Structure 1
Amino acid sequence: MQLLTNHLGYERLGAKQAILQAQHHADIICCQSGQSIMQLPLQACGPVAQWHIGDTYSIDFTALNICGDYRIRVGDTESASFCVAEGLLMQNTFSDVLHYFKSQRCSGIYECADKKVPLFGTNETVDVHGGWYDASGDVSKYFSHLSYGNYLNPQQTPMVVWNMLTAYEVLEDEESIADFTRVRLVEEALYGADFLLRMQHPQGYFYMTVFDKWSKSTEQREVCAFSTQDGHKSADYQAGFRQGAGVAIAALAAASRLSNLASTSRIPQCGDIKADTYLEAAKKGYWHLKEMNHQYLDNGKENIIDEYCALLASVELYRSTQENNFLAEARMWADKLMARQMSDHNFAHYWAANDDGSRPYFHAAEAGLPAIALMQYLQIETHAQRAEQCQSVLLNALNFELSITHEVNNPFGYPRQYTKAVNGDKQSAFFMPHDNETGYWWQGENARIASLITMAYMAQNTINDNEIKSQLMIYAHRLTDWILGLNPFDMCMLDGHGRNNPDYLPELGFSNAKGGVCNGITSGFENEQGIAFKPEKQKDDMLQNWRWGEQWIPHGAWYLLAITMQFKERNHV
Structure 2
Amino acid sequence: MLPEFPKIAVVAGSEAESVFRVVDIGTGDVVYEGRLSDSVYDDASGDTVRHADFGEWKRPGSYSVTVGRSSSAPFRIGNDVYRAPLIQAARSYTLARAGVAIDDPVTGLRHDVGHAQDKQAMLFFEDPFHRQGDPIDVSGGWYDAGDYGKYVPTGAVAAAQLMLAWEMRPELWRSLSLSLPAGLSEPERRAGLPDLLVEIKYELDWLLRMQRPDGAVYLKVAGGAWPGYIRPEEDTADRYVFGLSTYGTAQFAGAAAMGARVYAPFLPDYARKLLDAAIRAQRYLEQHPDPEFRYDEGQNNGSGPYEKRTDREERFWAAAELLRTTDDARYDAYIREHFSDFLEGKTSAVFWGNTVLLGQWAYVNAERADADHKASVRASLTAYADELVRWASANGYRSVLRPTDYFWGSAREAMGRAQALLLADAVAPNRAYLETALDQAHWLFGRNAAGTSFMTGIGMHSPQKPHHRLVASTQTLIPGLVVGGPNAQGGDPIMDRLLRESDPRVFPAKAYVDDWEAYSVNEPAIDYTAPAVFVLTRFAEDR
Give per-residue Cα distances to partners, 1:109-160, cap 9 Å, x unaligned: 6432111111113222211001111112x0111123xxxxxxxxxxx11122
Give the whole-Å Cα distance in 1 for the aligned partners of 2:341 and 2:38: 43
The alpha-carbon deviation at position 510 of structure 1 amounts to 7.5
- CA offsets, 1:429-471, max 9 Å, x none? 2423xxxxxxxxxx2422222111111112112026xxxx233
Identity %: 18
Question: 1:246 — aligned with what?
Answer: 250
Aligned mate of 2:208, from 184, 197, 220: 197
Structure 1, gaps ≥5 residues long: 1-9, 145-155, 225-236, 266-271, 342-350, 352-360, 418-427, 433-442
Q: Structure 2: how far apart are the matches of 1:369 and 1:222?
A: 27
2:137 to 104, 124, 127: 127
Structure 1 counterpart of 2:198: 187
What is residue 241 of structure 2 aligned with on the other side?
Answer: 223
Contact 1:131 1:192 in 2 (8 A): yes
Residue type of the alignment partner of 2:164:
T
Which residue, out of 14, 25, 28, partners 1:31? 25
The residue aligned with 2:156 is 158
Do residues 429 (structure 1) and 404 (structure 2) align? yes
- Of 214, 233, 252 in structure 1, the residue corresponding to residue 226 of structure 2 is 214
Q: Which is worse superposed, 186-195 or 26-35?
A: 26-35
Question: CA-to-partner distance for each residue in 1:312-340, whole Å, 9 max, x for gaps?
Answer: 32232223222222233344565232456
Query: Match of 1:306?
Result: 311
Query: Are positions 1:79 and 2:72 aligned together?
Result: yes
* Contact 1:375–1:459 (Cα < 8 Å) also in 2: no
CA shift in 2, pair 1:251/1:275, >3 Å = same
Q: 1:57 aligns with which of 50, 53, 57?
A: 50
In 2: Cα distance, 1:118 partner to 1:260 partner: 33
**For residues 286-325 of structure 1, what are the structure 2 equivalents within 5 Å?**
286-297=282-293, 306-325=311-330
Distance across 1 between alignment mates of 2:338 and 2:28: 57
Q: Which amino acid aligns with 1:280?
A: D
Task: Tell me if the contact between 2:344 and 2:377 (Cα under 8 Å) persists in the aligned partners.
Answer: no
CA distance in 2, matches of 1:62, 1:298: 53
Q: CA deviation at 1:405?
A: 4.6
Q: Which residue matches 1:486?
A: 447
The aligned residue for residue 148 of structure 1 is none
Give the corresponding residue for 1:392.
379
Tell me the distance in 2 between the aligned counterparts of 1:30 and 1:177: 35
Listed one character per residue, the Cα deviations across residues 374-414 of structure 1 (whole Å, up to 9, x for unaligned) are 233111265442233223322222223334456xx731122
Structure 1: distance between partners of 2:536 and 2:309: 26
Deviates more, 1:479-488 or 1:288-297: 288-297
Match for residue 279 of structure 1 among 261, 275, 281 = 275
Note if contact 1:454-1:565 (Cα within 8 Å) is conserved in structure 2.
no
C-alpha spacing 1:306/1:367, structure 2 compared with 1 (3 Å): closer
1:413 alignment partner AA = R
Provide the C-alpha distance between the structure 2 equivalents of 1:159 and 1:171, rounded to a whole number of angstroms. Answer: 19
Mapped partners of 2:352, 2:35: distance in 1: 36
Encode CA deviations 1:20-79: one digit per residue, 9 max, x unaligned. 1224111222233221112222113422226333x2111222223332222211123111
CA contact (8 A) 2:62 2:74 kept: yes
The 3-state SS of whatever aligns with 1:314 is helix
Q: What's the secondary structure of 1:549's corresponding residue?
A: coil
Q: TM-score, normalised by structure 2?
A: 0.78
Q: Measure the CA separation in 2 of the matches of 1:325 and 1:528.
A: 53
**Per-residue deviation, 1:13:** 2.0
- The answer as to whether partners of 1:73 and 1:79 remain within 8 angstroms in 2 is yes
Amino acid at match of 1:411: G
Q: Which residue in 2 is equivalent to 1:6?
A: none
| Aligned counterparts of 2:483 and 2:4: Cα–Cα separation in 1 | 28
Q: Please, which runs of 5 or more residues in structure 2 have no aligned partner? A: 100-111, 126-131, 179-192, 229-234, 296-306, 490-498
Answer whether contact 1:334 1:374 (CA < 8 A) is retained. Answer: no
Q: Deviations over 1:181-217 (max 9, x none)?
A: 6621111111111011001011111111112232364
Contact 2:250–2:315 (CA under 8 A) maintained in structure 1:
yes
Aligned to 1:509: 473
Alignment CA distance shift 1:289-1:449 (3 Å) = same
For the 8 Å contact 2:349–2:413, the answer to whether it is kept is: no
Distance 1:561 1:333 in 2: 30
| Structure 2 residue 387 is the aligned partner of structure 1 residue 414 | no
Counterpart of 2:364 in structure 1 is 378
Match for residue 523 of structure 1 among 472, 485, 488? 488
Corresponding residue to 1:496 among 447, 457, 482: 457
Change (3 A) 1:74 1:177: farther
Code of the residue aligned with 1:504 in structure 2: it is P
- Is 2:142 the counterpart of 1:142? no
For residues 507 and 349 of structure 2, what CA distance do their matches in structure 1 show? 17
Change in 2 beyond 3 A, CA 1:82/1:169: same
- Does the 8 Å contact 2:513/2:522 carry over to 1? no
1:470 is matched with which residue? 431
Equivalent pair of 1:366/1:448 in contact (CA under 8 Å): no
Structure 1 position 366, deviation (Å): 6.4
Instruction: Return the offset for 1:477.
Output: 1.9
How many Å apart are 1:172 and its aligned residue? 2.1
Partner SS for 1:455: helix
Letter in structure 1 aligned against 2:529: G
- Within the candidate set 173, 178, 182, 2:175 is matched to 178
Q: In the aligned structure 2, how far is the partner of 1:563 from the partner of 1:36?
A: 30
**1:96 shift after superposition:** 1.5
- Whether the 8 Å contact between 2:484 and 2:520 is mirrored in structure 1 is yes
C-alpha separation in 2, matches of 1:221 and 1:260: 33
Candidates 86, 96, 106, aligned match of 1:94: 86
Q: Is the 8 A contact 2:446 2:459 kept in 1?
A: yes
For 1:493 and 1:31, locate their aligned partners in 2 and report how far apart those are by CA, in whole Å: 26
Amino acid in structure 1 at the alignment position of 2:148: V
CA distance in 2, matches of 1:335, 1:528: 42
Whether the 8 Å contact between 1:140 and 1:214 is mirrored in structure 2 is no
User: How many aligned positions are there?
Assistant: 471
Q: TM-score scaled by structure 1?
A: 0.74
The residue aligned with 1:356 is none
Query: Is 1:16 paired with 2:7?
Result: yes
Q: Secondary structure of the residue that 1:414 maps to in structure 2? A: coil
Whether the aligned pair in 2 keeps the contact of 1:375 and 1:462 (CA below 8 Å) is no
Distance 2:60 2:338 in 1: 45
Q: Distance in 2 between matches of 1:521 and 1:205?
A: 36
Q: How far apart, CA to CA, are the structure 1 residues paired with 2:531 and 2:120?
A: 31
Aligned mates of 1:57, 1:480 — CA distance in 2: 19
Aligned residue number for residue 186 of structure 2: none
